[PDB]
Design a protein around this nucleic acid. Structure first.
Lengths: 205, 57, 262, 151
RNA sequence: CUCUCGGCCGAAGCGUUUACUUUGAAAAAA
RNA sequence: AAACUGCGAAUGGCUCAUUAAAUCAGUUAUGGUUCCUUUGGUCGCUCGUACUUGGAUAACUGUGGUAAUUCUAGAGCUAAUACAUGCCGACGGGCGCUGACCCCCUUCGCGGGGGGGAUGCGUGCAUUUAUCAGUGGUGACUCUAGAUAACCUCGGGCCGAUCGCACGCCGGCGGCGACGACCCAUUCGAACGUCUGCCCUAUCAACUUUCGAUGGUAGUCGCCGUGCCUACCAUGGUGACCACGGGUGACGGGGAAUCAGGGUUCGAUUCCGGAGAGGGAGCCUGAGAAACGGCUACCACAUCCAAGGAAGGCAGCAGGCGCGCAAAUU
């Protein structure tokens, strides 16, 4: 029953308007269906023109983009760590746009060790199971043994990312509006944005 | 009664017809896109020949 | 209202249709089509009012329903189909062919034309865009989209459409010295040579036109239709040659043309 | 840090600022490329728009607005908000009966970009129409000329 | 009213900004 | 005939109660959005039972209830362009990642460089995110196209299980139509904005701001732009150039009466635009309605009743009562 008209306000001078019609249908607004963390549940809406809006109520996965490596994989959303509008939305674990989430780094770890042949996020004791020994210590051909070592020089990672790879949980920021498209996509936090939101979460407590 | 969902010679002819309209729509996309591939060659070669009189002079 | 209007009052009709006051409350209300409803002549007005073939708005139904009427070479069974500028009306049962061109006074005209000319029409290019795996398109003023155009066709030029196939044959570009017809405004239906085109970026281009007698006029750019390359029209012209007579000499023509009688 | 005063991260959204570099990139220079664009009606983009560090999504040289419609002018009266000022336009209204005019005025709230820094009240400013930026703001400041009592 | 170009003739710039006046084009039909 | 399905019923008609920068008029904008239809485009562009799929349901037959309604319940059949599910064909491939292996050149050799390649993975056009480079455009795009990595909603996104008429050509190959159909364009619009403009009143001079008032940031919602709304901030915004409040025997214009010239007054009323269907409010369906010759409430009236219930909305055309100085035919 919400109405997002402009005529229920005061004028710029401060005078109140006497209205000249009743609430029209194109002025409507619908309730906020806040997207929580759970197994997927979307409910389609019928909007103007007969089109569809995917009003998501629970979401569990969403594909994110490691920007500096051109790697887009579908991860598992874990948590909400910080929301820069309201902080009661963090204790309610609501997924909105531009909220910082914890994702699962395991699809990116499998891409990194497949593309660069370097162990990422392993402990110092380095218990290396044989099923990934064949991708970390493979048998290379004559032209491939130089190609992998040619890739291996610039295969460095900023150390703020590797501490997240140690525990398996990356920081990500949602860039799509889940209550309107039904998806929770986004990107992985890298660099200056990462060390901004890190100290925001640290000073939050 | 009138049997519906019967494989009538008319019914089978209609499936032949709209398959024939798929071939004609693929016929033109092979032939319309070839002529513009020819027409872009003249309008690229003439621009290249105009280039050689303004960069040289 | 709530949703679109389906009626047209008579006094609210376009002035150039020349519907009288006392025949009804309503006017024919053109169907949606290629032309704006202010810029068109419905097929009921061309048959009943102009040509005097029909006598009522039921005989236009009885004529169009025998499929006797082709508008741009396709048979039209809507009596309120908006025919507009440069549209060819082929009636084959009688043998006539018309083209809708404006005359010097801002209306349309019954312009009978030869069936050797009725195989083509001109259109004006309105927007050119690429898309769909890099395939270029035109959009003309009839909403005709002609994909794969010539790369030297740009906006505001004139193509020549073959009406049996739909394809472009040859074009004219927007330049000075080209023969143009004005298709809107107070200089509507006037034919002259493009003199000058003044640019107003963020507003409308003004295109100064020069008559064949020396009468200069100007319009906005959107009321400009390039008809010929140079001074030779690629279509025929009406009985008057697109040259507007002032009312004094328009009177002199009548009071001297009655003196040929006896 | 001289930009990030907010609670979310101020970032120019078109520019990717986490490109991977090599040892001549980390030792050479920490270079943030900036997004600027040309307003098409003969307004020069200031050098502050090309060299600044401010972030503004409604700046007409660096943000997401396009200037279309009427281009107007007015003089500054009150600069007491965040990034927006109040200009007053002065005009004469012809009264037909008396064959005379009368002084009239209307105010406009108008967005001032941070590239136009050191603007004092009482100088003429060109404004340009865009989409609604807030409830009362629909024009954006385009060039600032100074009052004749300057030097 | 002048500077860099195209075929002496057009672009582009103006000059401090306007009011005034004249022309133009746009202004539903009745 | 009936009934299912489709489409319309959102237009037209009526009235003028609201409403004073509101409506509206001229002027611009959508580079900030949706658009049934019409017209043009597109519709083997995707490499992975079909010579035809599945279950119901009316009309109909038959048995009933209730004082009563365009009220309906149960039983037996049967269709689809209703509701569903779902291939083949084009189809041979091609393009990107991989990549055992093989081959070639040079080097004494190491080494360096260049081709072919089985294996697996992903491939269109719409959707959503991120990154790269710079065919066509504008006055200016964060535009249009291109490339790359992925996603693609079970309340699913397209890729046709459809009807007709003439009949055929060498078991295949067919010609004209009718319905559909995602997306693009157009048409018809709608919406939200820009600038300028309106009657009387100061016995209305300060107003707005808890409860959004003006602005900033992040989002929610919405067709989209925005305090539209929410969180955190900043303390602003309008006012003798008459804000704010009250009034109007105020719907606004095109126009009408009078008039030397200037003016004054009227404009409910047949054209354009707004609003509203007794008063407020909320919805369903649909391209479009906050719809009233649609529904659900409440307040006000009021019809039938077997007292348990049922149905309403003439500011449509007629007509009636009331009102009044004041207005026509069921």
């Amino acid at each position: 029953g919400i109405s997002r008209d402009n005529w229920h306000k005061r004028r710029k001078t401060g005078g109140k308007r006497k209205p000249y019609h009743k609430k029209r249908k194109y002025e409507l607004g619908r309730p906020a269906a806040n997207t929580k963390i759970g197994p997927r549940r979307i409910h389609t809406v019928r909007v103007r023109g007969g089109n569809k809006k995917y009003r998501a109520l629970r979401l569990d996965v969403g594909n994110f983009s490691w920007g500096s490596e051109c790697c887009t994989r579908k991860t598992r959303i874990i948590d909400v760590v910080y929301n820069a509008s309201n902080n009661e939305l963090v204790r309610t674990k609501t997924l909105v746009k531009n909220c910082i989430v914890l994702i699962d780094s395991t699809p990116y770890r499998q891409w990194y060790e497949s593309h660069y042949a370097l162990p990422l996020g392993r402990k110092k004791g380095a218990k290396l199971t044989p099923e990934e020994e064949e991708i970390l210590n493979k048998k290379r051909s004559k032209k491939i043994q130089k190609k992998y070592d040619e890739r291996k020089k610039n295969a460095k990672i900023s150390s703020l990312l590797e501490e997240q790879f140690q525990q398996g949980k990356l920081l990500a920021c949602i860039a799509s509006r889940p209550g309107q498209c039904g998806r929770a996509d986004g990107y992985v936090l890298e660099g200056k944005e990462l060390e901004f939101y890190l100290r925001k979460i640290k000073a939050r407590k | 009664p009138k049997i519906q969902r019967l494989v009538t010679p008319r019914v089978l002819q209609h499936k032949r017809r709209r398959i024939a309209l798929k071939k004609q729509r693929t016929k033109k996309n092979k032939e319309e896109a070839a002529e513009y591939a020819k027409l872009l060659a003249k309008r690229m070669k003439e621009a290249k020949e105009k280039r050689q009189e303004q960069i040289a002079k | 209202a709530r949703g679109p209007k389906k009626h047209l009052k008579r006094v609210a009709a376009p002035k150039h249709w020349m519907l009288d006051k006392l025949t009804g409350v309503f006017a024919p209300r053109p169907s949606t089509g290629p032309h704006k409803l202010r810029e068109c002549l419905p097929l009921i007005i061309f048959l009943r009012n102009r040509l005097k073939y029909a006598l009522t708005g039921d005989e236009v139904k009885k004529i169009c329903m025998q499929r006797f009427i082709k508008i741009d070479g396709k048979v039209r069974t809507d009596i309120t189909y908006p025919a507009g500028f440069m549209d060819v009306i082929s009636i084959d049962k009688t043998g006539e062919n018309f083209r809708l061109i404006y005359d010097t006074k801002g209306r349309f005209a019954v312009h009978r034309i030869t069936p050797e000319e009725a195989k083509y029409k001109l259109c004006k290019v309105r927007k050119i865009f690429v898309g769909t795996k890099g395939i270029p398109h035109l959009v003309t003023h009839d909403a005709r989209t002609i994909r794969y155009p010539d790369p030297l066709i740009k906006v505001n030029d004139t193509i020549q459409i073959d009406l049996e196939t739909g394809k472009i044959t040859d074009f004219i570009k927007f330049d000075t010295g080209n023969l143009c017809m004005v298709t809107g405004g107070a200089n509507l239906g006037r034919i002259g040579v493009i003199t000058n085109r003044e640019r107003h970026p963020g507003s409308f281009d003004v295109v100064h036109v020069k008559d064949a007698n020396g009468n200069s006029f100007a319009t906005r750019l959107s009321n400009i239709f390039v008809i010929g390359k140079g001074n030779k029209p690629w279509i025929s012209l009406p009985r008057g040659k697109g040259i507007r007579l002032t009312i004094a000499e328009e009177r002199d023509k009548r009071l001297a043309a009655k003196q040929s009688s006896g | 840090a001289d930009i990030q005063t907010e609670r979310a991260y101020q970032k120019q959204p078109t520019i990717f600022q986490n490109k991977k570099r090599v040892l001549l990139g980390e030792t050479g220079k920490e270079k943030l490329p900036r997004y600027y664009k040309n307003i098409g009606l003969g307004f020069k983009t200031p050098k502050e728009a090309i060299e600044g560090t401010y972030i503004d999504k409604k700046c007409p040289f660096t943000g997401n607005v396009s200037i279309r419609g009427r281009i107007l002018s007015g003089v500054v009266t009150k600069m007491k908000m965040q990034r927006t000022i109040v200009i007053r336009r002065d005009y004469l209204h012809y009264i037909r009966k008396y064959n005379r005019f009368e002084k009239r005025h209307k105010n406009m709230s108008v967005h001032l970009s941070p590239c136009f820094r050191d603007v004092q009240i009482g100088d003429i400013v060109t404004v340009g129409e865009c989409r609604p930026l807030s409830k009362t703001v629909r024009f954006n400041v385009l060039k600032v000329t100074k009052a004749a009592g300057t030097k």
